[PDB]
């Protein structure tokens, strides 16, 4: 079986490179962040523009939804994160503490904590309610490219241009595991699988890898795309067939069969690097976003 993603909508509005796209967990919305300092909200099924959320002083590298789709957190070059009430557009808290650009962010499943990664080489854990920095982890020796909580929020996985993937105990801040595969290319993205058993990691040597983190073993490799320069997001698509989805520096969206590792579809249309992709939580819909020469987001739909 192979999917049949087809272009449905193109979303224009950002004035600079788009950096990250994410669907709300309730499937109603798409949030996008950009180097233009703005967050934009769009309808997930029709691509209709909803509103702009402003307040950061410099460009934004990431945005993430809370579990209940009520809040967003954004990470900016202004060295802050901001927690937003999506329905009102209000900035509830500004998270100050990183000493350099904030690159990545996520809520935990309970949505009471935020994790962030920065050019200052640290991973920070923040209290959502008070906006206070609870813990600072001296995590890496180069910028932190991604941070993500596991299924119950007990662990954090982080990646960095230093070539490492690390697993941290949320409660103690202890480094439980360092994962690396015999070459040291920058690790440009990492996330836990929906079931929490695996970690999907991207490296700047044109490779995605699926790790069993309990065993510290690489189980699957996905190749064929171009990724040597940018921190491109990758996803598990689970609504229909089980795929791995990623953007690429050759301007395409790549889709692989998770089990066989074969490329099953390539989505053509963007005119610059596809930096971010997201998979809709219930429908076979992919959102893709591109860099400065393109500035658009595309919504693609498949029958499987």
């Amino acid at each position: 079986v192979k999917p049949n993603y087809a272009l449905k909508f193109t979303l224009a509005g950002h004035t600079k490179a788009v950096s990250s796209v994410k669907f709300s967990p309730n499937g109603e919305w798409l949030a996008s962040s950009s180097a233009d300092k703005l967050i934009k909200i769009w309808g997930a099924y029709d691509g209709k523009f909803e509103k702009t959320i402003s307040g950061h002083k410099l460009g934004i590298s990431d945005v993430a939804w809370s579990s209940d789709s009520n809040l967003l957190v954004s990470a900016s070059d202004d060295k802050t994160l901001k927690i937003w009430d999506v329905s009102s557009g209000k900035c509830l808290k500004t998270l100050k503490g990183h000493s350099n650009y904030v690159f990545c962010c996520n809520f935990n499943p309970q949505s009471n904590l935020i994790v962030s990664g920065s050019f200052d080489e640290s991973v920070r854990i923040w209290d959502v309610k008070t906006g206070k920095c609870l813990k600072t982890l001296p995590a890496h020796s180069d910028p932190v490219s991604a941070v993500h909580f596991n299924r119950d929020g007990s662990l954090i996985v982080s990646s960095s241009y230093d070539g490492l993937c690390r697993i941290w105990d949320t409660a103690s801040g202890q480094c439980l595991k360092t994962l690396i595969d015999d070459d040291n290319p920058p690790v440009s993205f990492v996330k836990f699988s929906p079931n929490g058993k695996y970690i999907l990691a991207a490296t700047l040597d044109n490779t995605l890898k699926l790790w069993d983190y309990s065993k510290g073993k690489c189980l699957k490799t996905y190749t064929g795309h171009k990724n040597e320069k940018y921190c491109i997001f990758a996803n598990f698509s689970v609504t229909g067939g089980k795929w791995i989805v990623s953007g690429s520096e050759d301007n395409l969206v790549y889709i692989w069969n998770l089990q066989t590792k074969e490329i099953v579809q390539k989505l053509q249309g963007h005119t610059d690097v596809v930096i971010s992709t997201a998979c809709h939580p219930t429908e076979n819909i992919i959102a893709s976003a591109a860099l400065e020469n393109d500035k658009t987001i595309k919504l693609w739909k498949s029958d499987c």
Partner: peptide
């Protein structure tokens, strides 16, 4: 700008 939209060299 935004750091994700830039190249970072070790």
């Amino acid at each position: 700008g935004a750091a994700r939209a830039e190249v970072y060299l070790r």
